[PDB]
Amino acid sequence: LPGEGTQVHPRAPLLQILKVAGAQEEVFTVKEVMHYLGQYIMMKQLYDKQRQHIVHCHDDPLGELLEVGSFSVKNPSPLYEMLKRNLVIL
Numbered sequence: 001l002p003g004e005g006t007q008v009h010p011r012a013p014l015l016q017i018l019k020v021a022g023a024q025e026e027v028f029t030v031k032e033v034m035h036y037l038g039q040y041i042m043m044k045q046l047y048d049k050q051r052q053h054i055v056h057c058h059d060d061p062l063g064e065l066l067e068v069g070s071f072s073v074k075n076p077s078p079l080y081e082m083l084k085r086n087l088v089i090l
Contacts, residue, residue, distance in 0.1 A: 001030050001080060001083055001084065001087070002029075002030060002089055003030075004029060004030075004031060005029065006029065006030075006089065006090070007027050007028065007029060007090045008027070008028055008029070008030060008033065008087040008088060008089055008090060009026065009027055009028075009087070009088040009090055010026075010028065010033065010086060010087060010088075011085075011086045011087070011088065013061070013064070013065055013086065014033075014065060014082075014083075014086040014087070016061070017036075017037070017040055017061060017062060017065070018033065018036040018037070018040070020040055020043075021036040021037070021039035021040035021043060022036070022039060023036045027090065030083070030087070033083065033087070037062075037079070040062065041055055041057075041062070044060060044062075046060060046062065053072055053073045053074050054070060054071075054072055054073075055070060055071055055072075055073065056069065056070045057069065057070065057071070058070065065082050065085075065086060066078050066079065066082050067082070
């Protein structure tokens with residue numbers, strides 16, 4: 001994934017999710033994309049209630065993009081691989 005200044009354009013399925021989280025933009029930095037994904041998970045309360053570094057996305061559109069039912073915020077590989085599939089580097 002690109003550095004802090006480089007801009008990316010999210011593919012439609014990801015952009016849709018960022019929109020739900022309140023994103024108005026169509027072009028982002030990776031950090032901004034990550035901000036809105038965190039907002040999304042928080043709003044939808046997808047994190048495990050007791051162990052909150054675990055996210056359960058099996059019955060959510062986010063899980064369709066990540067292709068996994070759960071992941072750990074401390075093992076973000078699945079997130080980064082999803083972004084590689086869903087970000088156009090500008």
